[PDB]
Design a protein around this ligand. Structure first.
Ligand SMILES: *[C@@H]1O[C@H](CO[C@H]2O[C@@H](C)[C@@H](O)[C@@H](O)[C@@H]2O)[C@@H](O[C@@H]2O[C@H](CO)[C@@H](O)[C@H](O)[C@H]2NC(C)=O)[C@H](O)[C@H]1NC(C)=O
Ligand SMILES: *[C@@H]1O[C@H](CO[C@H]2O[C@@H](C)[C@@H](O)[C@@H](O)[C@@H]2O)[C@@H](O[C@@H]2O[C@H](CO)[C@@H](O)[C@H](O)[C@H]2NC(C)=O)[C@H](O)[C@H]1NC(C)=O
Ligand SMILES: *[C@@H]1O[C@H](CO)[C@@H](O[C@@H]2O[C@H](CO)[C@@H](O)[C@H](O)[C@H]2NC(C)=O)[C@H](O)[C@H]1NC(C)=O
Ligand SMILES: *[C@@H]1O[C@H](CO)[C@@H](O[C@@H]2O[C@H](CO)[C@@H](O)[C@H](O)[C@H]2NC(C)=O)[C@H](O)[C@H]1NC(C)=O
Ligand SMILES: *[C@@H]1O[C@H](CO)[C@@H](O[C@@H]2O[C@H](CO)[C@@H](O)[C@H](O)[C@H]2NC(C)=O)[C@H](O)[C@H]1NC(C)=O
Ligand SMILES: *[C@@H]1O[C@H](CO[C@H]2O[C@@H](C)[C@@H](O)[C@@H](O)[C@@H]2O)[C@@H](O)[C@H](O)[C@H]1NC(C)=O
Ligand SMILES: Cc1ccc2c(c1)sc(-c1ccc(N(C)C)cc1)[n+]2C
Ligand SMILES: Cc1ccc2c(c1)sc(-c1ccc(N(C)C)cc1)[n+]2C
Ligand SMILES: Cc1ccc2c(c1)sc(-c1ccc(N(C)C)cc1)[n+]2C
Ligand SMILES: Cc1ccc2c(c1)sc(-c1ccc(N(C)C)cc1)[n+]2C
Ligand SMILES: *[C@@H]1O[C@H](CO)[C@@H](O)[C@H](O)[C@H]1NC(C)=O
Ligand SMILES: *[C@@H]1O[C@H](CO)[C@@H](O)[C@H](O)[C@H]1NC(C)=O
Ligand SMILES: *[C@@H]1O[C@H](CO)[C@@H](O)[C@H](O)[C@H]1NC(C)=O
Ligand SMILES: *[C@@H]1O[C@H](CO)[C@@H](O)[C@H](O)[C@H]1NC(C)=O
Ligand SMILES: *[C@@H]1O[C@H](CO)[C@@H](O)[C@H](O)[C@H]1NC(C)=O
Ligand SMILES: *[C@@H]1O[C@H](CO)[C@@H](O)[C@H](O)[C@H]1NC(C)=O
Ligand SMILES: *[C@@H]1O[C@H](CO)[C@@H](O)[C@H](O)[C@H]1NC(C)=O
Ligand SMILES: [Cl-]
Ligand SMILES: [Cl-]
Lengths: 527, 526
């Protein structure tokens, strides 16, 4: 039998046979009291104890969401929808462990993305089963509340203070600090890593004083808090929740009364008016997300970073080649996953229309000018590949690079990567290229499974990425081997050296999209 | 040494040049003196004189203001007129090889000076060298500048505008009725000018009245599509009415405005030209070419795109640091005697001066486009950038943009990039290769070896002299010096140009492409 005593009681797991070895999994362990009606919107409250032996043999419920319905049956959009049944009773975590039991293993904890409006820890692509076998690490992933249930903000009010989903993540980190040693883990060798909103969440735990002693290092895949979508100001967050109050018919006059209504509305009706809280939305809009709550975040995050008020620690940051493409099929005119989606100049301007609603026409025009210096002026996809770069450069790449630059200026080693390989099984058309969120499959080592129809070169690349991610976790250095391996240098604001990741050849280069990033950091703000 | 023109006889003088001799005729009147009743009018054709005319010395320069910002300084004073100033100035010069040729091609020089100054008699325009070594006849005119040459009361024949341009055209008419008596070919005639002269040359390609009077054109650091070259009708009229108010001639109708101006002392007109436009810059042309419906039948950009111009091969070019010559005249932090390093804010102040009417975002847009340093450590960054901002916008990008459209219509276009700084140039080193300091090289001044030039400058000058002359004769500045670069032809896609310096002569593509795309595709929307 497979049992282990937690500070909250005993829990039993299951054996899995992987690559000829065995990995022990504990799926759906509760870490906080169910945030049911009274506690809804409150911070997660700590567990007491449970009866008998919890069987952690099945993924738990996903926290409440809307689902991607745009293309039914399509694996590309379906793979990101929650694969468990959805509920407010949803604060659970998973633990994968190498067998035989490790004495003092390093722990990796995954924080899923999804724009702070979706996500779950039970997707196939987040299966930690492999990482535990290949590199003998302990992998933990947790469900955190998302959407209005997770980040409704009336700061100063304990009934709905904002940043609850972040406080869900934080208490899960506290649980690992309290328990993972029983599992054979090292609570002082703990590395956070997430993608998109998960990477943004990871970046903010570096700022929050409460998380400064719950983890050792951080990995940020295609996300950082200084992205335009990550953090919303204090009073637009409140303007958002006052609007949701009316939309649901319970604008009352003193705040705790308005939460009293929202606690009695079924989770659905809250979920289907989350989208009307903003007057002018883009495909990349975060209606209810992180905010400056005065508890998790004591100031606007860009300031905290500029003043060095953060955890001093190694970080591994990176991005994909075509991060913007995934969002154009979700509103940009002329774009479809079933075309090759070659647009014309006016369709391009109508695209900026969508992604930059409140920007002046002089500002749109300057964005166009900076991305229209065609090296070859006869190729149609010029305007198609331009807007995908605009969306990706402004929302992911240039903030991630700018965050690393500012972070490295305070004396801690930073390593930047540029993921350039398109998966052989990518169900989207290839005009979308190396898409957002499609490096995760290689991070978790899915191409190591031989029965999955991945190429041999994709297994080699996945085997490499996995070794470097785990080596960064254990040692703070993303090496692969001492010999026969391209050395990954540190990112420092002068040379700005990054490492490319693909199947042809990994090599060192400098100043990633520096001519494009200069526009977004030094000219677009003044517009 | 006398020659019978169709208006009379003129006497010349023998010049001993490089051991040989060249015969010079300095100061032959090609038009009636534009005085009294004739001020502000198009040049009147001249009647014959029964005596013999003495063309033995340079004639008087046209009335103009004089650069006295740096008294004593050879660098600013070498452009001032070297003869007396007078409204009686419509004269030309002719240099001719000895032994006299009988159908040499002829090169006509149109001087620059912002349409405000200039004269044919300056040492850097001495045509005697060109006639000696390349055996070509060289002609230079004096055309009215300032308000006396370009004041425009549009539609009114008493002050129609572009009078100085008609001055040039009447000189061009003269060479065609008289250069055969000098040994010249009236049907193999090349116009070359610099700055306002090159601008003037480009507008002769558009004027139908001048289609009959030359063959090819060479345009040094100037074109009509340059921002300073042509002033709009509304601008020209406001400018004319402002000069009337300043000189006490604000009156009832236009013909009374003009009679009052005809009675003003010449200096009462030139000393008020500076106040005629409120937002003047260093490069400001107070009175210049306009669309008069006579010399220019409408707006030049139009006529160019529509294809109504003389179809012929041209030679266009610029110098590496065109804009540096103007930062000395008003840009804060600059000086002839400093090293002239400026702050970012001093740079932003300089932008305000050269771009007075542009919005704050527009200046901010210029600042960003020229702040992509290759090395940020260098303190010279902001001083070099504004010099390039002024150079690109005012000269380089217009010249390239002019050459592209012209070559499009199936004409042989040749573009050069002059990169050599004269070892004699009296301005400081930081100004680099300045506006106008390729002229002495084109006129072959380094060819006389007692003038303190480097012999590298002699080789450089003699080659420029040869290609300029061969472009005039043949329509391709080939230079027969064994192994030497084949000057190819400018074309819209590859856009190949020829470098000029003592070290070597290379061949390149798309000059200042990243910079010029800003000035042609984005800045007209700020
Ligand atoms: C979690 O575990 C068992 C389910 O079945 C497990 O039984 C273990 C003894 C072990 O062999 C494991 O491999 C196997 O999957 C539930 O056990 C209860 O108690 C006895 C123990 O053998 C079972 O026979 C009963 O069927 C079962 N239910 C009872 C007694 O009501 C255990 O309850 C389950 N936990 C929960 C919360 O359901
Ligand atoms: C057309 O001219 C007017 C007046 O021009 C005046 O400018 C002085 C510098 C001087 O030459 C004087 O003799 C002449 O009368 C211009 O109007 C001026 O515009 C500025 C704004 O740039 C105002 O601050 C002035 O008060 C105003 N003055 C007058 C008398 O109107 C005008 O700008 C100019 N250009 C146009 C109309 O396009
Ligand atoms: C697991 O490893 C950790 C460190 O990775 C051990 O804890 C500490 O080790 C470092 C020494 O480098 C120091 O901070 C302390 O000496 C240790 N902490 C203590 C003693 O509280 C930890 O001992 C290891 N655990 C096991 C079971 O091997
Ligand atoms: C990656 O590089 C680090 C650099 O030191 C290596 O770290 C050492 O790892 C051994 C375990 O093999 C430890 O006992 C040492 O204490 C570590 N040294 C330091 C300075 O941290 C690491 O081994 C390398 N990884 C691989 C796979 O070669
Ligand atoms: C121009 O304006 C003046 C303003 O007076 C007019 O000049 C008059 O001319 C007529 C006939 O030549 C005479 O009666 C007077 O000698 C002039 N006026 C005065 C006050 O002496 C002239 O007619 C105007 N021209 C026009 C309107 O075309
Ligand atoms: C790993 O090396 C492969 C070849 O083996 C190495 O052996 C060294 C001793 C030396 O002789 C070299 O010939 C080789 O580098 C090479 O073909 C692979 O590409 C390398 N693979 C990785 C992932 O680095
Ligand atoms: C209605 C609906 C359903 C699903 C859904 C959304 C909206 S929005 C979203 C999303 C994902 C990522 C991001 N960023 C990376 C900023 C923003 C939003 N999902 C997954
Ligand atoms: C209804 C709606 C509107 C927008 C929208 C979505 C759904 S979904 C989406 C998106 C969300 C997640 C992901 N990954 C995590 C790969 C990629 C794209 N956008 C931008
Ligand atoms: C007061 C004064 C005196 C002389 C003088 C000026 C002003 S301005 C000038 C001038 C020369 C060239 C140009 N461009 C070709 C742009 C514009 C102006 N000169 C020769
Ligand atoms: C008082 C004043 C103001 C402006 C100004 C001058 C004098 S002079 C000048 C200038 C004139 C001619 C030349 N060349 C012939 C090369 C170069 C620069 N600007 C632009
Ligand atoms: C699970 O772990 C290993 C798998 O090899 C084994 O020693 C142990 O007995 C297994 N327990 C089971 C299958 O109940
Ligand atoms: C792409 O598909 C959409 C929807 O079917 C359509 O509106 C658009 O015209 C298509 N693009 C092209 C180039 O056909
Ligand atoms: C022409 O020059 C001759 C040179 O001998 C001189 O005598 C004569 O005065 C000049 N012509 C006139 C009209 O003075
Ligand atoms: C002068 O030159 C032209 C060459 O283009 C020629 O037509 C003419 O016959 C030549 N000879 C003369 C005018 O005596
Ligand atoms: C350049 O000279 C000007 C005036 O002489 C002055 O304003 C400026 O400070 C000087 N800059 C130097 C000396 O660096
Ligand atoms: C050459 O140099 C000396 C002084 O340095 C000068 O006297 C001589 O006239 C110069 N040549 C000229 C000015 O043509
Ligand atoms: C230049 O071209 C003309 C005709 O195209 C020719 O007469 C001359 O010989 C050429 N230059 C040489 C051979 O250097
Ligand atoms: Cl290990
Ligand atoms: Cl320089």
């Amino acid at each position: 039998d497979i049992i282990i005593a937690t500070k909250n009681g005993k829990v039993r797991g299951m054996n899995l046979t992987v690559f000829g070895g065995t990995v022990t999994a504990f799926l759906g362990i509760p870490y906080a009291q169910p945030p049911l009606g009274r506690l809804r919107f409150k911070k997660p409250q700590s567990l007491t104890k449970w009866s008998d032996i919890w069987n952690a043999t099945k993924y738990a419920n996903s926290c409440c969401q809307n689902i991607d319905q745009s293309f039914p049956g399509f694996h590309g959009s379906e793979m990101w929808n929650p694969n468990t049944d959805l509920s407010e009773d949803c604060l659970y975590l998973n633990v994968w462990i190498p067998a035989p039991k490790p004495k003092n293993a390093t722990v990796l904890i995954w924080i899923y993305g999804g724009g702070f409006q979706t996500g779950t820890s039970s997707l196939h692509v987040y299966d930690g089963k492999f990482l535990a076998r290949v590199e003998r690490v302990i992998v933990v992933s947790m469900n955190y509340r998302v959407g209005a249930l997770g980040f409704l903000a009336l700061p100063g009010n304990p009934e709905a203070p904002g940043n609850m989903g972040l406080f869900d993540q934080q208490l899960a980190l506290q649980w690992v600090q309290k328990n993972i040693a029983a599992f054979g883990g090292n609570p002082k060798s703990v590395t956070l890593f997430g993608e998109s909103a998960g990477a943004a969440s990871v970046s903010l735990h570096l700022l929050s004083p409460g998380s400064h002693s719950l983890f050792t290092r951080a990995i940020l895949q295609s996300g950082s808090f200084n992205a335009p979508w990550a953090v919303t100001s204090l009073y637009e967050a409140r303007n958002r929740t006052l609007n949701l109050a009316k939309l649901t018919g319970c604008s009352r006059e003193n705040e705790t009364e308005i939460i009293k209504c929202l606690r009695n509305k079924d989770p659905q009706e809250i979920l289907l008016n989350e989208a009307f809280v903003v007057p002018y939305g883009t495909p990349l809009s975060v209606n209810f997300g992180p905010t400056v709550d005065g508890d998790f975040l004591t100031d606007m995050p860009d300031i905290l970073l500029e003043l060095g008020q953060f955890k001093k620690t190694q970080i591994l940051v990176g991005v994909n080649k075509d991060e913007g493409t995934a969002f154009l099929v979700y509103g940009a005119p002329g774009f479809s996953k079933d075309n090759n989606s070659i647009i014309t100049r006016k369709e391009f301007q109508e695209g900026l229309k969508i992604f930059f609603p409140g920007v002046s026409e002089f500002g749109k025009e300057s964005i166009l000018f900076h991305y229209t210096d065609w090296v070859d002026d006869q190729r149609p996809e010029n305007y198609r590949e331009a807007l995908g770069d605009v969306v990706g450069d402004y929302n992911f790449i240039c903030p991630a690079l700018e965050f690393t630059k500012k972070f490295s200026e305070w004396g801690n080693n930073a390593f930047f990567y540029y993921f350039e390989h398109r998966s052989s099984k990518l169900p989207w058309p290839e005009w979308m290229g190396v898409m957002h969120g499609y490096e995760i499959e290689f991070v978790f080592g899915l191409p190591l499974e031989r029965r999955d129809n991945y190429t041999k070169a994709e297994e080699i690349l996945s085997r490499s990425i996995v070794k470097r991610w785990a080596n960064f976790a254990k040692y703070g250095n993303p090496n692969e081997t001492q010999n026969n391996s391209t050395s990954w240098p540190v990112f420092k604001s002068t040379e700005q050296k990054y490492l490319t990741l693909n199947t042809e050849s990994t090599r060192i280069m400098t100043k990633l999209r520096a001519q494009q990033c200069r526009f977004w950091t030094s000219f677009f703000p003044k517009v």
